[PDB]
Amino acid sequence: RLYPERLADRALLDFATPHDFHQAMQGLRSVLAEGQSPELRAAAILLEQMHADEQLMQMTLHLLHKV
Amino acid sequence: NITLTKRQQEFLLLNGWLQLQCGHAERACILLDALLTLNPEHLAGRRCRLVALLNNNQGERAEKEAQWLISHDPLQAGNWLCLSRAQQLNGDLDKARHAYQHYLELKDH
Ligand SMILES: [Cl-]
């Protein structure tokens, strides 16, 4: 095949890959809770919605060898 | 005035990537927008949000963010691959093909 487009998706997600969880999450929510911009107010609400998923998030990041 | 420490910027970045890698593209954009509002020069967050915007079908925002990385980091070939995908989502197949060629060229250095 002329063009390796089958490897395009894998290359995009490698490109996006960057090179205690409970305490760090509570600290980040603490800081984002003071932001008044829409971006910080949106992320603070999101991190609060995913609060019941902290163990799942930490477990998955641990399996991905990141946290 | 709001600031994140270095470890907090990385923790917010890893959670943004987690949502991307796990198929929650919009959550990745929400988290990484807050990261890049407080530190707009964070390249790893720029790259993650870019691919997050692609998976969230936001080709307009992705194109501008692909241009931003092309300007502030022209050596990285992955920038033109992102511009190719965004212009593809925007319907401009001619531009998407040209940006893909530069991706292939820049990979060979
Ligand atoms: Cl506790």
Residue numbers in the entry:
A (entry chain B): 45 to 63, 74 to 121
B (entry chain A): 2 to 110
Give sentences copied directly from the paper behind this entry.
SctX proteins are secreted substrates and are essential components of type III secretion systems. The dedicated chaperone SctY escorts SctX proteins to the secretion machinery, where the hydrophobic helix at the C-terminus of SctX mediates recognition by the export apparatus.
The AscX31–YscY complex crystallized with two almost identical complexes in the asymmetric unit. Despite AscX containing all amino acids after residue 30, the electron density only supported model building from Arg45, indicating that the N-terminus is disordered. Superimposing the YscY monomers using LSQKAB revealed a purely rotational relation between the two chains, with an angle of 90.1° between the twofold axis and the centroid vector and a rotation of χ = 179.0°. An extended C-terminus of AscX would not fit into this configuration of the proteins, hence the α3 kink facilitates the assembly of the disulfide-bridged heterotetramer in the asymmetric unit of the AscX31–YscY crystals. In AscX31–YscY, the distance between the phenylalanine side chain and the terminal methyl group of Met79 amounts to 3.9 Å.
